[PDB]
Design a protein around this ligand. Structure first.
Ligand code: GNP
Ligand code: CA
Ligand code: MG
Length: 159
């Protein structure tokens, strides 16, 4: 059956692991270990297609992807530095993949928190400059989580 190899990248502590665990295990982790590299595999139904999601959860911490088919580029809406650092991760992707045309979604996580320091308009403008969708998420409330992963699946489908 069809398998979508997704890779989740972004700065440390933005909620990459929490988002992944919320999609795959359907619960929120309040306290998680920084990642070296972890992978999750799950059979799902998306738009009437039964498929398998292989998600690679990568390290955000600097102390640390090529087979990836689609990329979730994650920042946290209450972490300006993570947003300012997004261009880096897009660059490495275009680099390792050898393409300016790679399925990718920009994700603004922790949208449940009220200490927003990155405005939606700014992230939208960035996403449009890359030619990609922008989706805001909360791994805590599950807001936008399916939207983000499923949009990525659909971007891979269109490619
Ligand atoms: N309120 C809230 N907290 C969140 C959300 N996502 C993650 N967190 C919290 O943020 C912390 C770090 O999340 P984590 O998933 O470990 O981040 P990471 O990007 O995987 N880290 P690393 O890059 O080091 O592997 C955890 O305490 C987690 O509960 C979210 O959407 N909302
Ligand atoms: Ca595939
Ligand atoms: Mg992690």
């Amino acid at each position: 059956m069809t398998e979508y190899k997704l890779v989740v990248v972004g700065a440390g502590g933005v909620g990459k692991s929490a988002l992944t665990i919320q999609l795959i295990q359907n619960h929120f982790v309040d306290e998680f270990d920084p990642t070296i590299e972890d992978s999750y595999r799950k059979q799902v139904v998306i738009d009437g297609e039964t498929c398998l999601l292989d998600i690679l959860d990568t390290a955000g911490q600097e102390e640390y992807m090529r087979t990836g088919e689609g990329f979730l580029c994650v920042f946290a809406i209450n972490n300006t530095k993570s947003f300012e650092d997004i261009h880096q991760y897009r660059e490495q992707i275009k680099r390792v993949k050898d393409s300016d045309d790679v399925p990718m979604v920009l994700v603004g996580n922790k949208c449940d928190l009220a200490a927003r320091t990155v405005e939606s308009r700014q992230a939208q403008d960035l996403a449009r400059s890359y030619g990609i969708p922008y989706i805001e998420t909360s791994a805590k409330t599950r807001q936008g989580v399916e939207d983000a992963f499923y949009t990525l699946v659909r971007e891979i489908r269109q490619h």
